[PDB]
Amino acid sequence: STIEERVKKIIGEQLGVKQEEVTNNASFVEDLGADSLDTVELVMALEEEFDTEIPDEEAEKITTVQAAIDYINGHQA
Amino acid sequence: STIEERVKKIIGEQLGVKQEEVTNNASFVEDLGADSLDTVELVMALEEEFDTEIPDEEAEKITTVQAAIDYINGHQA
Amino acid sequence: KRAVITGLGIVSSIGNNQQEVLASLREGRSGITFSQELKDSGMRSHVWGNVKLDTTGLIDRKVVRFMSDASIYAFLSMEQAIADAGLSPEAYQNNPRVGLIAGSGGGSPRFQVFGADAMRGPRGLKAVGPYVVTKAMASGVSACLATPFKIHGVNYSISSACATSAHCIGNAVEQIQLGKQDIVFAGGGEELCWEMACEFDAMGALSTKYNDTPEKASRTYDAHRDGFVIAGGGGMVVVEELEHALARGAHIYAEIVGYGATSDGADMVAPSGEGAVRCMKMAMHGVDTPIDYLNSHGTSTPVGDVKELAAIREVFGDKSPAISATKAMTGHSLGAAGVQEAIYSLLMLEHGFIAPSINIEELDEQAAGLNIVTETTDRELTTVMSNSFGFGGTNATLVMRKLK
Amino acid sequence: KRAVITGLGIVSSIGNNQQEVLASLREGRSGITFSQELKDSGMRSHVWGNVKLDTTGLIDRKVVRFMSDASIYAFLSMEQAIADAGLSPEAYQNNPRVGLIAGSGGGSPRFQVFGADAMRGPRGLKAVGPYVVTKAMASGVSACLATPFKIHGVNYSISSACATSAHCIGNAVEQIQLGKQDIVFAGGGEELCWEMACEFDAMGALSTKYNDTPEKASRTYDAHRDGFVIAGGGGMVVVEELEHALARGAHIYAEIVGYGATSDGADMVAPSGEGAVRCMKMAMHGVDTPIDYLNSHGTSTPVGDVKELAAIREVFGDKSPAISATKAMTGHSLGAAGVQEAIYSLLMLEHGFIAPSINIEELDEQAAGLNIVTETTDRELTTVMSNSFGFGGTNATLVMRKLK
Ligand code: NA
Ligand code: NA
């Protein structure tokens, strides 16, 4: 699929929520029931899906789904 | 140094005895206080100081100090 | 205060529940199979007592993410024990009177190696992950179980080599005797992997001769034994105060009437017998009933089987009980051996029979005079004893007796 | 049924015996240094609370061959405790009334990875050695110590993450309370290595933004705390029955007048406070005197310190006692923290002072209204309390009071 559908596919794949729940508005902790350890493992899979490197200061601000699409839409060269 | 003095250095350090207490006819268990696990560790230090394997069998015949001194030179297969 | 076993669950090498385990106990079936993983690592022992169970999907993702295989086996055993006890969440969850004492022998060597290879790998710290601590820690069994079951009482792991889950049970009984708890879940688990088995092979303690005949490797009291066969799995029993179990009409397997815990204080790896003698007599204290069956430690090792035999002589003498080493068919599940043998003893006491000590072709010369049971025998049992000994000369003995 | 502490022994980042510790405590001396090992492994946290001691050759060869660092630290600590208690060899050796309960948080990850690298190396099983099991197993501490000290009574390890050695002490008290033991050595130990620390770093639990200033990396209750600083070491206390200690004219530091051990049953990695409230109230039950000093668990973590503070508020209300987190000086010794912080509290009780909570440049807004001592203060203490919390929501609280 596309970059956003891939991003939306991998989070629900790791958060036990359906693809209809992962909205662009949604956040991991509040709306999706994720803890701090969940978001760590989520960053790890994001680095495997797109074969990219995500610094900890950049991975600190990916608090929502839209922040995950925004980061992937700018690191792929 | 000579071969024999290098195996005695091993036995004395692995078992915690003075170097001149490691006589050739000294038994590991009866004279040097070695037990089961001391035997396995003893054959290990021989493989590390020198550069030969001791594929078991020989390791079980080595009950005294002289038995080791014989097999460090009278073999090397 | 008196404590009773009110429920049990087990994931063993001879069954994935008390039904299957009973079917192997009456039959004398070996749980030991050939192990290919033990070959590929370069070990001399290619034989283990593995758990034949597909655990995928049996635990929630947010729960199993913290668990090693030892925690997985204990969780599945605790699920069985809860249901077998008739306990609903409103009776044991969020209850300060309900605790959990379950440990393992050494956490998870497998996931410790995983984190080290990940740290020393290309990605380094990025590849380790945030779930290796709860898997590698020594109290992973009690930690990974207390949170999902909402345990509010006592919560920790006891570790004492192969006497681990036996001490866990005795400590649970002590918690009830002090009046601090009404129910304590007690047990433990062990993962089965080469990272942990190869270190017993370097000691020369594993059976290595009977690789092409796996069901004959574990042969306690046989004159041709080769060392123990490593095994894994888990067990859990519901230790409950008597009046609390009677008030709600619980099913009571037996009452813990004795608990022994001593130390040899002599040799680090070889037992001395004197400690086992004091440990068995400490557990028989106040027990008016003779011991009808004794579940020996029986590691199928050259030295340990003899010293325990002489210890059994010194305590009984002429009034020896029926003796069977369940490890002959199950293997040595180490940290989970204690609770599993306690369950085997409970099943014999519950169903009135005695499981056989198999593979005793040529009996050991020092057995002489002790009624070993080599074939299944139906018998009305009322009092049963199980021995569990660990490295460092630590001993544990449990005595269970039918109620009333 | 009354238990007292009659001997201390400690090897920590602020002292290799109780005298050196007493000096560091009075002065607020940090024990945290820069670690080249932690930096070379590729970790973000380059600071630790190391033991400033070369243990090479301090223990007999036939004893240390089985030991990891956790057993070495605890062995040295027990030697000090034995001499401090005035126990001759004939008074505690080969004595079924004398036991030992000491554990570690996670065995020895270093020697576990060593055996795996040796097994997968060019030599394979030949390079592993026969001593990896006793080092890497979870009961290595209690087993490596009970054999040379000839312990004949109770012998096992308790594991409960960072409440480990605190539960050991409480469990030792219980053995005395029901008359099973006259003396139990309680404590623990913890090695310090990248194999164990890098797994906490992968969770984001370690202090990472103070590597240039190690002595203020551990800053409990400070607004800019980054996480805990890992530490190692060991500790051992002599738990004794009261009239037994009086009959032999022993020196009695304090009496264990309270012991709490509860569980959260909510979250795995973050405390809830509710369990700690029950744990503190459980340890204060029947204690007629107020708590003068409270050695908090205070781990210098963002969420850990505020939850315990909320728990302290609910427990004591307005009459909050003097609070100090020694982890700001020592770091977090994990399995050894419970016994070490109990020893710090005993030194403060015996010598009549309150060690300061250092590195509080800006007190956390959620810590106002409390009596957090930041400067060394002489004060006649009568009753002290120490909290210890671990992964899995397990809590332990010890209350110690001067005698007569
Ligand atoms: Na048994
Ligand atoms: Na404390």
Author numbering:
A (entry chain D), B (entry chain C): 1 to 77
C (entry chain B), D (entry chain A): 2 to 405
Give me lines lifted from the publication on this model.
In these pathways, β-ketoacyl ACP synthases, alternatively ketosynthases (KSs), catalyze carbon–carbon formation via a precisely choreographed decarboxylative Claisen-like condensation to produce a β-ketoacyl species. The small, 4-α-helical acyl carrier protein (ACP) is used to shuttle substrates and intermediates to each catalytic domain or discrete enzyme in these pathways. Specifically, we propose that the elongating KSs employ two conserved active site loops that open and close through a double drawbridge-like gating mechanism in order to regulate substrate processing.
In addition, C12AcpP–FabB crystals diffracted to 1.55 Å and C16AcpP–FabB diffracted to 2.50 Å. Additional analysis for the C12AcpP–FabF and C16AcpP–FabB structures can be found in Supplementary Notes 1 and 2. In FabF, individual ACP monomers, AcpP1 and AcpP2, bury surface areas of 671.2 Å2 and 675.4 Å2, respectively, while in FabB, AcpP1, and AcpP2 bury surface areas of 597.5 Å2 and 607.4 Å2, respectively. In addition, the differences in contact areas of AcpP–FabF and AcpP–FabB interfaces are consistent with the differing orientations that the AcpPs adopt relative to their KS partners.
